[PDB]
Enzyme design. Structure first.
Site, PDB file in Angstrom:
ATOM      1  N   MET A 109       0.587  -1.184  -0.040  1.00 24.87           N
ATOM      2  CA  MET A 109      -0.126   0.018  -0.084  1.00 24.87           C
ATOM      3  C   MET A 109       1.045   1.182   0.332  1.00 24.87           C
ATOM      4  O   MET A 109       0.694   2.499   0.469  1.00 24.87           O
ATOM      5  CB  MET A 109      -1.219   0.159   1.017  1.00 24.87           C
ATOM      6  CG  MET A 109      -1.702  -1.171   1.003  1.00 24.87           C
ATOM      7  SD  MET A 109      -2.616  -0.873  -0.455  1.00 24.87           S
ATOM      8  CE  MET A 109      -3.447   0.616  -0.868  1.00 24.87           C
ATOM      9  N   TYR A 111       4.044   3.231  -2.665  1.00 35.26           N
ATOM     10  CA  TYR A 111       4.894   3.074  -4.041  1.00 35.26           C
ATOM     11  C   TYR A 111       6.432   3.447  -3.529  1.00 35.26           C
ATOM     12  O   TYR A 111       6.502   3.383  -2.797  1.00 35.26           O
ATOM     13  CB  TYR A 111       3.961   4.905  -4.517  1.00 35.26           C
ATOM     14  CG  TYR A 111       2.764   5.245  -4.508  1.00 35.26           C
ATOM     15  CD1 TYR A 111       2.206   4.718  -6.025  1.00 35.26           C
ATOM     16  CD2 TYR A 111       2.048   5.808  -4.113  1.00 35.26           C
ATOM     17  CE1 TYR A 111       1.019   4.706  -6.021  1.00 35.26           C
ATOM     18  CE2 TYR A 111       1.216   6.427  -3.533  1.00 35.26           C
ATOM     19  CZ  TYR A 111       0.429   5.742  -5.239  1.00 35.26           C
ATOM     20  OH  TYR A 111      -0.981   6.281  -5.848  1.00 35.26           O
ATOM     21  N   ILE A 116       3.243   6.856   0.741  1.00 32.93           N
ATOM     22  CA  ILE A 116       2.028   6.158   0.562  1.00 32.93           C
ATOM     23  C   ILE A 116       1.124   6.370  -0.504  1.00 32.93           C
ATOM     24  O   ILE A 116       0.512   7.116  -0.508  1.00 32.93           O
ATOM     25  CB  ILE A 116       1.256   6.656   2.398  1.00 32.93           C
ATOM     26  CG1 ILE A 116       0.543   8.107   1.800  1.00 32.93           C
ATOM     27  CG2 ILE A 116       2.085   7.121   3.329  1.00 32.93           C
ATOM     28  CD1 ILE A 116      -0.047   8.455   3.190  1.00 32.93           C
ATOM     29  N   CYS A 117       0.001   5.003  -0.484  1.00 29.82           N
ATOM     30  CA  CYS A 117      -0.661   4.599  -1.056  1.00 29.82           C
ATOM     31  C   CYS A 117      -1.947   4.831  -0.499  1.00 29.82           C
ATOM     32  O   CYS A 117      -2.419   3.786  -0.331  1.00 29.82           O
ATOM     33  CB  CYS A 117      -0.280   3.218  -2.293  1.00 29.82           C
ATOM     34  SG  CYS A 117      -1.757   3.334  -3.571  1.00 29.82           S
ATOM     35  N   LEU A 118      -3.018   5.917  -1.284  1.00 34.37           N
ATOM     36  CA  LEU A 118      -4.367   6.172  -1.130  1.00 34.37           C
ATOM     37  C   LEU A 118      -5.154   5.003  -1.729  1.00 34.37           C
ATOM     38  O   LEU A 118      -4.976   4.861  -2.639  1.00 34.37           O
ATOM     39  CB  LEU A 118      -4.382   7.674  -0.624  1.00 34.37           C
ATOM     40  CG  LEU A 118      -3.123   8.598  -0.024  1.00 34.37           C
ATOM     41  CD1 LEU A 118      -3.972  10.001   0.798  1.00 34.37           C
ATOM     42  CD2 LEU A 118      -3.714   7.282   2.046  1.00 34.37           C
TER      43      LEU A 118
END
Length: 166
Positions: A109, A111, A116-118
């Site tokens: 979750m 990159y 952070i990947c939302l």
């Protein structure tokens, strides 16, 4: 909508921002930063009054580089992580990308580079609120919900382990 009520329940007592200005916009950016610092300080004060003082942030002189720490409590143990982000030229229409560098490569979750990947829901929520949402909302609606899923999951999978410090 459930989403609209969910959004209001989280952000209603966070001061709303006004100025459409990014890092290059001179006296308008200085104005935006005042709104950003006022919204952040109130969010922190509400957080303290609700026993949820979960982050500290500072910026460079120009307010284009932000860095601090976030804390997350699981089974009464407090986990601390360094956080940072740049302000995009296109801010506040474009949302910042929060990085938690120590977790780089430790969760799907996220990159490369610790960004952070939302969920596909944060970005359109930001877009329809522009320019009223600022850094306090990015923390309340972005990082906060991220930690609340990822930190428990990485502790469970034994990727994160607690500092046995006094």
């Amino acid at each position: 909508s459930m989403a609209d009520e969910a959004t209001r329940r989280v952000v209603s007592e966070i001061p709303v921002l006004k100025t459409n200005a990014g890092p290059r916009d001179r006296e308008l950016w200085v104005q935006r930063l005042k709104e950003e610092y006022q919204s952040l300080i109130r969010y922190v004060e509400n957080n303290k009054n609700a026993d949820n003082d979960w982050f500290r942030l500072e910026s460079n002189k120009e307010g284009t580089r932000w860095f601090g720490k976030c804390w997350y409590i699981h089974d009464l143990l407090k986990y601390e992580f360094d956080i940072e982000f740049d302000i995009p030229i296109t801010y506040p229409t474009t949302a910042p990308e929060i990085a938690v560098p120590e977790l780089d490569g430790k969760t799907a979750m996220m990159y490369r580079g610790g960004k952070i990947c939302l969920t596909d829901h944060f970005k359109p929520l930001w877009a329809r609120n522009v320019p009223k949402f600022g850094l306090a909302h990015l923390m309340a609606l972005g990082l906060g919900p991220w930690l609340a899923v990822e930190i428990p999951d990485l502790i469970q999978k034994g990727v994160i382990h607690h500092k046995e410090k006094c």
